[PDB]
Design a protein around this ligand. Structure first.
Ligand SMILES: O=C[C@H](O)[C@@H](O)[C@H](O[C@@H]1O[C@H](CO)[C@H](O)[C@H](O)[C@H]1O)[C@H](O)CO
Ligand SMILES: O=C[C@H](O)[C@@H](O)[C@H](O[C@@H]1O[C@H](CO)[C@H](O)[C@H](O)[C@H]1O)[C@H](O)CO
Lengths: 134, 134
């Protein structure tokens, strides 16, 4: 599938909503949504949101200087192979709210300053219908 | 039609998202989304968002101590009688972003402080499928 990768040169601020609509392929392993602080491979990640169909979990984390932080896991897995989905990633002063379907799923407190984010990437085993930043 | 009215006793903040899904009746005239600062119908309004199918405009305004402020109008009318719609009202530190469909429609600067909001009303000529505060 074609991934999404787009620059946020003015950054994101509290009140930013990333809306992602798509379908999990029937043979999917994992896909990811990253909010990154640079363009180079290995750049710091303010948020890594990683639905894992192969291991029935959704992992949240950050990355600084090449190292992963403490993993946070949401409750259950609100994604199914072969099914469409809608995700909101909502930025506040305190963190990122992940909404899947009709309910908040998990809240990830900021570890890196939000002002460091300047790129969004959506990739892995996912068919994207739309990616929008409001 | 059945309206929505729910309390926000803790107020709202940058990163609050109101997601409204519904259908505009085929003979609709107007409907509204209000963020109010009290429990009475005449309570101050931090946001009054008023799609008007009868006069082909969408009006934004605030109300304080019984008086309306300066009206703001969006570009065109992204609603149609008989059609379903999705609206996001997204709060930032600077204002409310109104998203309709796949695009930001208008940005309305705060006239009232966010901390004063404590009620959300959705009513008028509209059929509501979902009202959520994220
Ligand atoms: O934590 C242990 C779990 O068993 C597993 O989550 C971890 O995997 C990485 O997790 C990263 C996010 O913390 C990121 O997703 C990366 O891509 C993954 O390889 C570990 O490295 C070990 O397997
Ligand atoms: O032609 C534009 C007019 O300015 C018209 O829009 C005004 O309508 C009110 O507008 C309010 C929001 O400003 C709110 O919607 C109220 O319910 C409406 O009666 C009123 O006739 C005069 O103030």
């Amino acid at each position: 599938n074609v991934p999404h990768k787009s620059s946020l040169p003015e950054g994101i601020r509290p009140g930013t909503v990333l809306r992602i609509r798509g379908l999990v392929p029937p043979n999917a392993s994992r896909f990811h949504v990253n909010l990154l602080c640079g363009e180079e491979q290995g750049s710091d990640a303010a948020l890594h949101f990683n639905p894992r169909l192969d291991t029935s979990e959704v992992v949240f984390n950050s990355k600084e200087q090449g190292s992963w932080g403490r993993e946070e896991r949401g409750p259950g897995v609100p994604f199914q192979r072969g099914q469409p989905f809608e995700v909101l990633i909502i930025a506040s002063d305190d963190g990122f709210k992940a909404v899947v379907g009709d309910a908040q799923y998990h809240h990830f407190r900021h570890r890196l300053p939000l002002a460091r984010v300047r790129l969004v990437e959506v990739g892995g085993d996912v068919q994207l219908d739309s990616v929008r930043i409001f």
